[PDB]
Design a protein around this ligand. Structure first.
Ligand code: NI
Length: 341
């Protein structure tokens, strides 16, 4: 059965609720982004209306084989009427195609669902500035003060310089980047760009990337591994065993691997700076774990919520334990008392 935080009161709408069969009363199913916990249950046999961004729609069609007739793509930053209710989709600053959804209820209530997001001060000058929000359905992935990490810009600087230095010292070095879903493409794109290379990958991943409306993508990626010195591999394969095995396959083209594992937060954050991060090393192979997040830090989240001043907050992540729920409500109350709403 569909949980309460996936239902929108006073509508026939659900959000990211595809793994429960047919939901009684649902006239339209919203999908915020193309990540598997969120699309879980969609397939080519689905026969209800799906509302989403253009990019999420390209991926539903080509990767999941959902039929064209049930795909309703909406432009961003645009007031749209769906089943007689006004809605707006806004960029979530998560992965490609990810959105937040504003719902204007027929009774005058205004709801924001964030989907997954990385809060940013630029959201404070979207269409959110222009009216009040009564309920906030919030991505609470990192809702605790210990969850710190650098900006995406700083992480990317670190990766580019690490790669450029290593390959300038040893032109026979190969760079490998891990991936298991969409998101974080800037990591491998920025490294490839500084090395004057395209990114090589499997046919299945090249297909996924072609769905994303990235400018000049055909100049940036390829299925021809041999021509490229940046390779993507499934994240599971980013270990000494996997990478050794991969180095064999390149046929004496390369004598060293430098690899990057993008993670969310890791406890190495609580002591060490991005400047100071070191790899794990075995022989001619080095693996760097880098903290490239596409979710809000605690500080980013707190700033967004204090600016929005919602009357009620409904969390959508970490909801399964009494201790998590209780911890989150405490931070909400401090935030509210500090800012005066
Ligand atoms: Ni996500």
């Amino acid at each position: 059965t569909c949980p309460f935080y996936k239902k929108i009161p006073g509508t026939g709408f659900t959000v990211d609720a595809f793994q429960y069969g047919v939901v009684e009363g649902c006239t339209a199913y919203f999908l915020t982004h193309f990540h598997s916990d969120h699309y879980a249950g969609l397939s080519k046999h689905f026969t209800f209306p799906v509302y989403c961004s253009e990019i999420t729609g390209n991926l539903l069609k080509n990767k999941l084989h959902v039929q064209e007739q049930y795909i309703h793509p909406l432009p961003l930053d645009t007031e749209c009427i769906v089943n007689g209710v006004k809605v707006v989709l806004l960029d979530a600053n998560h992965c490609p195609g990810a959105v937040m959804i504003l719902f204007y209820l027929p009774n005058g209530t205004v709801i924001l669902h964030t989907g997954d997001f990385r809060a940013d001060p630029s959201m404070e000058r979207s269409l959110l500035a222009d009216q009040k929000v009564h309920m906030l359905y919030l991505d609470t992935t990192y809702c605790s003060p210990e969850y710190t990490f650098p900006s995406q810009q700083e992480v990317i600087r670190f990766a580019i310089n690490t790669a450029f230095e290593a390959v300038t010292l040893n032109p026979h070095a190969l760079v490998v980047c891990g991936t298991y879903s969409i998101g974080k493409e800037k990591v491998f794109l920025a490294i490839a760009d500084v090395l004057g290379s395209k990114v090589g990958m499997s046919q299945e991943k090249y297909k996924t990337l072609q769905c994303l409306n990235i400018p000049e993508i055909n100049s940036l990626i390829t299925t021809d591994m041999c021509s490229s010195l940046v390779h993507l591999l499934p994240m599971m394969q980013i270990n000494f065993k996997g990478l050794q095995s991969h180095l064999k396959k390149c046929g004496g083209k390369y004598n060293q691997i430098l690899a990057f594992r993008p993670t969310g937060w890791t406890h190495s954050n609580k002591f060490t700076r991005i400047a100071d991060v070191i790899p794990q090393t075995k022989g001619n192979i080095s693996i760097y774990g880098i903290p490239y997040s596409e979710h809000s830090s605690y500080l980013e989240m707190k700033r967004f919520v204090q600016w929005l001043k919602p009357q009620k907050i409904i969390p959508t992540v970490n909801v399964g334990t009494w201790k998590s729920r209780s911890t989150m409500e405490k931070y909400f109350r401090e935030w509210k008392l500090e800012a005066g709403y």
